[PDB]
Amino acid sequence: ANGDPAKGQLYFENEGGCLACHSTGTDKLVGPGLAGVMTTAGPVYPEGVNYRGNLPNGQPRTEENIAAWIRSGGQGQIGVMSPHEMSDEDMANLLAYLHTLKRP
């Protein structure tokens, strides 16, 4: 919505620390690559991991549930997320930058 992908990228690289665990493409550092994470197809998971088209916590793939997962974190078959509480404008910018990540 009212998100800034430049501020979103700055939060992704510094104030959020997401790049140190997540790749902007389809590679896997600690978690899955967030390429296409904001689309209905989801990101690229390693072979064997499957959440049945939903988030690792069980909720479907929507902006609200993805934001709630990011703020809450959790553990799935791959690794462990950390809780990243953030303001609403920062979350909007972060979701915008995640939208900028396209999965081929």
Q: What's 33's DSSP letter?
A: B
Closest alpha carbon to 25 in 34, 14, 17, 12: 34
d(CA 67, CA 45): 19
Member of 68, 79, 85, 89 binding ligand HEC (CB under 6 A): 79
State the binding string over 36-75 for ligand HEC (x if CB under 6 A, else -): -x----xx-----------xx---------x--xx-----
Residue 58 Ramachandran class (φ > 0 left, ψ -120 to 50 alpha, else beta) = left
Say whether residue 5 binds ligand HEC (CB under 6 A).
no
Member of 39, 46, 82, 89 binding ligand HEC (CB under 6 A): 82
Member of 58, 77, 85, 89 binding ligand HEC (CB under 6 A): 77
d(CA 27, CA 15): 22
Nearest-5° Cα angle at 83, 64 to 58: 50
103 assigned binding-site residue: no
Say whether residue 92 binds ligand HEC (CB under 6 A).
no
Q: Which residues bind ligand HEC (CB under 6 A)?
A: 16-18, 20-22, 30-32, 34, 37, 42-43, 55-56, 66, 69-70, 76-82, 84, 94
